[PDB]
Amino acid sequence: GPHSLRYFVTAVSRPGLGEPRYMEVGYVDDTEFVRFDSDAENPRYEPRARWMEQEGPEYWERETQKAKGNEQSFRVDLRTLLGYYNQSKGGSHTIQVISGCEVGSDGRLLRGYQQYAYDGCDYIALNEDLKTWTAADMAALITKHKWEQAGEAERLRAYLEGTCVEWLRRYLKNGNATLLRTDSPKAHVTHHSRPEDKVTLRCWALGFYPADITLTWQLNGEELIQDMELVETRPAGDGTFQKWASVVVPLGKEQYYTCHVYHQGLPEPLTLRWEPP
Amino acid sequence: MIQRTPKIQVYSRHPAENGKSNFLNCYVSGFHPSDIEVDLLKNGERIEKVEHSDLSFSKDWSFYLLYYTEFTPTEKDEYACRVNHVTLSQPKIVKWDRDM
Amino acid sequence: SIINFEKL
Amino acid sequence: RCEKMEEETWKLKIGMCIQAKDFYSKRTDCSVHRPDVGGGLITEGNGYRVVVHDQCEEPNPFIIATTKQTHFGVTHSYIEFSNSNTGAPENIPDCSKHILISVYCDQEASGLDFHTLKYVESNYLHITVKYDTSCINHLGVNYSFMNECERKLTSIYETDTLTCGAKDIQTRDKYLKTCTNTKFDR
């Protein structure tokens, strides 16, 4: 299947409290493998995956220098946007950047990622053509005009098609054994008499990796989608995830309903019913 | 600019059987800006030692954190989670349900 | 390897 | 790049996910009316009735044209305000771009403890939401306002995460129902 390498940059200002907090978090697919944090005991690039320990000191020195270099650039950009918008210096503002590339099985570049965000609103973003920009507001037009006369779009396309892909290939082969590792969801169905003259069946799914999972309730071979209370997948804290589906069924009809657990770590989708001990 | 109220979930790492040791988690997500205050409550009182995950954000620019601590659940001990954000008029309290 | 960002 | 028509066709979509508190919201049909009382629209459905106004006093075309609603589980209620062609924001009066949305609860007896929060602040749109926190556990707002050209050139960027009780946004939009011009009953 397809894969991607994305870097999540955070830049939050703190007026009268010191220099802005700077963060760089890399993601091979959905897995965090590197992290840099200015507000830490020691501001250096730290591995987040045990398969990144293979890289030598030469690698962790380059990325650190690049991180500090980036932090200074964003420290300026935080002040620069105060001028574009004509805002006050007393307020704390946030810059967020998502940057990376998605490469398919064929090795072909599928997506070029480069989007900026100021205070949660979209600011500027590299289009699919990898040559033009989409400015989300009046102030971004200033940035856009600067990047046109500087040819930033062309310099950026080079990184996306070249550098970013080369490193994705390297990261993938350096940790493919662990990236493929999957934990099977351990499922069970609980029972509660919460509604009046009715009950509630809650199908659980615990200790699974990755977060990709599908839980459905069925009756007469048909899925209950609107009648299904589904909660967001959450972390258990140990590296795995949890999720459950609730459905309100009439009393005495518990056995007529079945839960289904779909996951890539399962040889066969799980089928569960309510069962009293 | 945009602002988003944090989505809160209070849950345990494992199915709660009275007596066995466990972890207590409080998952805050979908909030902006990043500045958020989260503390865990044992019997209405704040737990002194609460560790939190590192800060991150999703594709909608929304931040998400995980606050966790070690604990041992009983029968009459009620746990909860206290979350305050700039988007909240008054701090949010969410009771812990061992089967939720 | 992340990219060397350009100023706004 | 793209055609002349694409650069001039502007579309507006406002998504809003409302989660019930201390009660179960029931799935139902939705209604929509333009009250002669005040400029805007009122919608009844999914245990809530929602009023949407603008800062215009002079009779101007309301920036929202279509309303849709759906329901998932027993807590989530989603509403989608749409407009297939608003035209360029340059040609739209500023007052019509300041939106005030009030969310009241019909199903459960309200405690009348409101909270006003400004969710969106941009050059194109202003979204302020006032809602009763006695019957509402959480409220999220998604906002999208751009032309067909820019939408086509930034489709790789996915900013919508308001699943609102469904597995994904696609499933949410599948069960959407267009609100009609008729009274309510419950």
Author numbering:
A (entry chain A): 1 to 277
B (entry chain B): 0 to 99
C (entry chain C): 1 to 8
D (entry chain D): 5 to 190
What did the publication describing this PDB structure actually write?
By contrast, CPXV203 is a soluble protein that prevents MHCI proteins from trafficking to the plasma membrane by a mechanism dependent upon its C-terminal KTEL sequence, a motif recognized by the KDELR. Crystallographic analysis reveals that CPXV203 adopts a β-sandwich topology reminiscent of poxvirus chemokine-binding proteins, and this domain engages evolutionarily conserved MHCI determinants available only on fully assembled MHCI. Together these data suggest that CPXV203 works cooperatively with the endogenous KDEL-mediated Golgi retrieval process to promiscuously target fully assembled MHCI, thereby preventing T-cell killing of cowpox infected cells.
The structure reveals that CPXV203 binds below the MHCI peptide-binding platform, contacting both the HC (α2- and α3-domains) and β2m. We note that while HCMV US2 also binds MHCI below the peptide-binding platform, the CPXV203 footprint is completely distinct and, strikingly, overlaps with that of Tpn, CD8, and NK cell receptors (NKRs). The single domain of CPXV203 (209 aa) is a globular β-sandwich that is stabilized by five disulfide bonds conserved in all T4 poxvirus protein family members. CPXV203 promiscuously binds MHCI through a large, somewhat nonpolar interface divided into three distinct contact regions (α2, α3, and β2m domains). Further, CPXV203 recognizes core structural features of the MHCI fold by anchoring each of the three domain interfaces through a buried MC-MC hydrogen bond and two to three MC-SC hydrogen bonds. Though CPXV203 makes contacts to three distinct MHCI domains, pH regulation of the complex half-life is critically dependent on CPXV203 His residues that bind to an α3-domain acidic CD loop important for both Tpn and CD8 association.
